[PDB]
Amino acid sequence: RCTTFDDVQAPNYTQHTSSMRGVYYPDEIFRSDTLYLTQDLFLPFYSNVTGFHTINHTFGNPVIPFKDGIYFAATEKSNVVRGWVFGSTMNNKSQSVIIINNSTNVVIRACNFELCDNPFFAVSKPMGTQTHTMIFDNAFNCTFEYISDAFSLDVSEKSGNFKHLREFVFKNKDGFLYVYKGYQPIDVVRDLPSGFNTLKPIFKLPLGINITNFRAILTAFSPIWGTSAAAYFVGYLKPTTFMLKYDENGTITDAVDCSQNPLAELKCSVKSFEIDKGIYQTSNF
């Protein structure tokens, strides 16, 4: 059954500092004891992140633009987002993608969906069990169907502060959705915790559609569909050049944006992080 949220309040659009996040393993190649300049879609350092906080009845989950790729990050205790809707118009006019976590597994289908105008995760809030994913009722012209492993998912109103910080990287690349995941164990209350963090690949998804937009699916925490306190974040992947440092283990320890300041492009030039006092010829203009 497609129903909507009722107590929909006004959005946030809070700006954040993207300080040292969004770095990931782009290929499936092992390199170590090295230093590697390359260009791909990336998060610009210290850039603006639009934050979507969930305060008492703010259902801050519109259809959000995607265009090449996005960053989902969320300081979570109750995991109030467990779903995303990929596509152009999302409805059963064209082929769209739903990736949701029904508290049992991650179920993924790419079909023409009869979407709700405000889809949500039906959860009894003080009991903590997800009852139904009130997202689509019918699916048509299905092209790919995925079911993850079954796992028990904490879906209650968690008290205390946010213990989980997932990082997500979503890329529409030539029929393929690439889904990457990172994690920080956190204990935070406020804006956006700074820190270096990496991601790893999980998914190559031959869904095969146009994805210009995406829809964030909140979890409805109701005892009438309701909330609990969380926040989540939207960033943009941009086609720029990074130089990345691999340890002996082939683990990213350190990387540098080229676009930040002329200091940074200099570091990209000489292929080092330690630059002597002097004057250095760099790129012309």
Ligand X SMILES: *[C@@H]1O[C@H](CO)[C@@H](O[C@@H]2O[C@H](CO)[C@@H](O)[C@H](O)[C@H]2NC(C)=O)[C@H](O)[C@H]1NC(C)=O
Ligand Y SMILES: *[C@@H]1O[C@H](CO)[C@@H](O[C@@H]2O[C@H](CO)[C@@H](O[C@@H]3O[C@H](CO)[C@@H](O)[C@H](O)[C@@H]3O)[C@H](O)[C@H]2NC(C)=O)[C@H](O)[C@H]1NC(C)=O
State which of residues 46, 140, 176, 183 lies at the interface with ligand X (CB under 6 A): 46
Measured from the CB of residue 246, what is the shortest distance to other proteins in angstroms? Answer: 10
State which of residues 4, 15, 249, 283 lies at the interface with ligand Y (CB under 6 A): 249
How many chain residues interact with ligand Y (CB under 6 A)? Answer: 3
Residue 266: in which H helix or E strand, if any? helix 262-270
Measured from the CB of residue 246, what is the shortest distance to ligand Y in angstroms? Answer: 10
Contact 193, 231 (CB under 8 A): no
| Residue 25 contact partner, candidates other proteins, ligand X, ligand Y, none, CB within 5 to 8 A by sort of partner | other proteins
> Which two three-digit tokens encode residue 228?
């609990």
| Residue 276 contact partner, candidates other proteins, ligand Y, ligand X, none, CB within 5 to 8 A by sort of partner | none
> How many CA atoms lie less than 13 Å away from 188 in the CB half-sphere?
16
State which of residues 67, 132, 173, 200 lies at the interface with other proteins (CB under 8 A): 200
Q: Report how far apart, in Å, the C-alpha atoms of 282 and of each of 38, 198, 239, 277 are.
A: 18, 29, 21, 15
> Which two three-digit tokens encode residue 213?
């937009």
Q: Report how far apart, in Å, the C-alpha atoms of 261 and of each of 40, 268, 276 are.
A: 19, 11, 17
Measured from the CB of residue 234, what is the shortest distance to ligand X in angstroms? Answer: 14
| Residue 7 contact partner, candidates other proteins, ligand Y, ligand X, none, CB within 5 to 8 A by sort of partner | none
> Which two three-digit tokens encode residue 157?
């109103």
Contact characters 196-235, ligand Y, x per CB under 6 A: ----------------------------------------
Contact 273, 254 (CB under 8 A): yes
CA torsion, points 38, 275, 264, 233, in degrees to nearest 10?
80
CA 193 to mean position of chain CA atoms: 16
Q: For residues 95 and 177, what is the distance between their CA atoms, to the nearest angstrom?
A: 14
Measured from the CB of residue 142, what is the shortest distance to ligand X in angstroms? Answer: 29
247 binds ligand Y (CB under 6 A): yes
State which of residues 48, 194, 282, 283 lies at the interface with ligand X (CB under 6 A): 48
Contact 216, 86 (CB under 8 A): no
149 binds other proteins (CB under 8 A): no
State which of residues 29, 150, 224, 279 lies at the interface with other proteins (CB under 8 A): 29
Residues that bind ligand Y (CB under 6 A): 247-249
Residues that bind other proteins (CB under 8 A): 25, 28-34, 200-201, 249-250
Residues that bind ligand X (CB under 6 A): 15, 46-48
